[model samples]
Target: SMYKVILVNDDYTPMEFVIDVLQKFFSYDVERATQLMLAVHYQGKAICGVFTAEVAETKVAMVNKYARENEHPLLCTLEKA
Candidate 1:
């Protein structure tokens, strides 16, 4: 099955960090990443990408771990699609 991976917004996570994650992990360029980051900022969350269930889980876990290590409260989740 496929899943949609979404990055949830928070007051603690810097917008720059979110943009960087979108670029680094999802291969989004600066402009697109910025737009998506803005959507997350104003819309509460944004879809980062869609992938297989396994891949989605791994991506969410990796992103969440990285955010935690950096002391940011960023969160990620996935849903069936």
Candidate 2:
């Protein structure tokens, strides 16, 4: 199994910002980022990537750090996929 890191939506978070974050930090181009962002917006959640547990955890930490520093409502998490 792979570890899936996901973005979960909330009322306060902006969809555009989520797309931007994925593009910026994950090295995903704009179009793919927008697609995933739409999924998170409409479907309530979307996988950012699948990786080993350590990488997934590191991704979560990076997301949390960036969110806090930027004052965005980013909720990054992990699960088995």
Candidate 3:
């Protein structure tokens, strides 16, 4: 079974910064991160990745932790997909 890590949009987070984090931390490149950020901006959220449930949770936690440390609102959560 595959799991998805969802990134929720908030007014506080900048689109460009999100793209940077996606690229810097999540192994996404600039173009793909920009696309994902756009989806999150327009749709209010988007799946960041597909992985096992444990991996999904860990990745979400890492993203949130990194966001907090970076002082950005990179809200992330996990779900079965």
Backbone collisions counted per model: 0, 0, 0
Q: TM-score for every candidate vs. truth?
A: 0.96, 0.89, 0.89
Ranking by lDDT: 1, 2, 3
> Residue 12 error for model 2, in Å?
2.0
lDDT for 55 in candidate 2 is 83
Q: Quick one: best TM-score, which candidate?
A: 1
Where does model 1 exceed 4 Å of error? none
lDDT of 3: 0.85
Global fold similarity of model 1 (TM-score): 0.96
Give stretches of model 2 more than 4 Å off: none
Query: Least accurate stretch of 10 residues (summed lDDT) in model 2?
Result: 12-21
Cα lDDT, all candidates: 0.91, 0.85, 0.85
> Residue 68 deviation, candidate 1, in Å?
0.4
Error of 2 at 50 (Å): 0.2
Winner on TM-score (1 vs 2)? 1
Tens digit of per-residue lDDT, candidate 2, span 1-81: 679999998887776778778987688998999999888888999998899888888989988788878788789999998
| Most accurate candidate by lDDT | 1
